[PDB]
Design a protein around this ligand. Structure first.
Ligand code: H3Z
Ligand code: H3Z
Lengths: 224, 224
């Protein structure tokens, strides 16, 4: 099938472990510290992953950073969603960090994780494929609606290149549903809504100062 | 062209006047009171408008209310956006209520109205048509991602019926861009983001208790 889709598949990062500290008593602070540490390490590999997207590295460094600063949490959440598709009412943040309802309550994340489970529910019914997941991650990056873009036309071109890949993939692989590509695009509003909820929640955790956060995570959290 | 699109065009409500009180001194409270009063009256006609959407009135009353309670601010904002397309850095809330940057600052709405102007900017470059505007309003209603839906499959069917209308319209009217329907769908994340910003802002105005609000507006603002 589509070459961009195949390329994004081989660019997919390896799995990352959460490694919650086994000497630390379980608590909301422990769970939040674990999740923010995991996100920081995922962000490093997301930056390297974006360089494989056709045309992304030819944008200015400022535009690359603007797209990443608007899309980072959407990309993180799409990953948790995809890893959770074969599970029931549980979120696979990592193979060693699967959160059920009790753990979400203990971490103060019941509302956020329920929103992520709503994304999981919809993608389960659509039978989301890995090919579609990686293409939607790239589209979410290109379509992230930063207020600070310098080269608006180049970013629109990147959007068009990735949208074309999704449409070509669906036309060849899903002839039984001529509207499947658009159904995939119609899942992006809930992803944007859930990501905004997560950014706001963890910005407030940052303000309270009880959960340590690393530099790259803090950089994304403090972006305008 | 497409019959659903033609039907939505003839169902389009008449213009509504803001009628700011000419005896009241200008202030943030006056501007916010005017906008919330306008929104309340627009909501009444939005409820009547939704009954013309094929299949909407056959949903349960609870599902109709769930969709409206999730989408109401998206529908309101799409209207302001469309009315503003021929203007520059101004928002046409009504023919008698056009807000420029100074007025937005005075009302405490600079950040919200700048986000709405970002929607305007993108639709200007795409040359958004009235046919596309009314279809996107209906899609935003059907695709509003309420947590409380009873008949998930019927709501998905409504989404599919309206998505098909958009795709059929674009296939017939815009053969020069075979991806235009998907470009239209890719504007929905920013609409969802901007609507959430507006709901949160006016929920906080409600809490502060200095701006009177009418029953229907308050009902939507207080929905879960
Ligand atoms: C910041 C939290 C919500 C988070 C951490 C890792 C991840 O893959 C997705 C989300
Ligand atoms: C509630 C405010 C933001 C508002 C009022 C009327 C309208 O058409 C769109 C928005």
């Amino acid at each position: 099938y589509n070459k961009i889709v195949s390329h994004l598949l081989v660019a997919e990062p390896e799995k990352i472990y959460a490694m919650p500290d086994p000497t630390v008593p379980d608590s909301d602070i422990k769970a939040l510290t674990t999740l923010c540490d995991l996100a920081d390490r995922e962000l490093v590999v997301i930056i390297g992953w974006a360089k494989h997207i056709p045309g992304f590295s030819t944008l200015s460094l400022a535009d690359q950073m603007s797209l990443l600063q608007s899309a980072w949490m959407e990309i993180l959440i799409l990953g948790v969603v995809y890893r959770s598709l074969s599970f029931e009412d549980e979120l696979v943040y990592a193979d060693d960090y699967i959160m059920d309802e009790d753990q979400s309550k203990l971490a103060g994340l019941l509302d956020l994780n329920n929103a992520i489970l709503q994304l999981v529910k919809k993608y389960k019914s659509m039978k989301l494929e890995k090919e579609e997941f990686v293409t939607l991650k790239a589209i979410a990056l290109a379509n992230s609606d930063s207020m600070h873009i310098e080269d608006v036309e180049a970013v629109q071109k990147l959007q068009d290149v990735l949208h074309e890949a999704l449409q070509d993939y669906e036309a060849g692989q899903h002839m039984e549903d001529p509207r499947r590509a658009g159904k995939m695009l119609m899942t992006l509003p809930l992803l944007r809504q859930t990501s905004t909820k997560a950014v706001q929640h963890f910005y407030n955790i940052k303000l309270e100062g009880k959960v340590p956060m690393h530099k790259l995570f803090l950089e994304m959290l403090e972006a305008k």
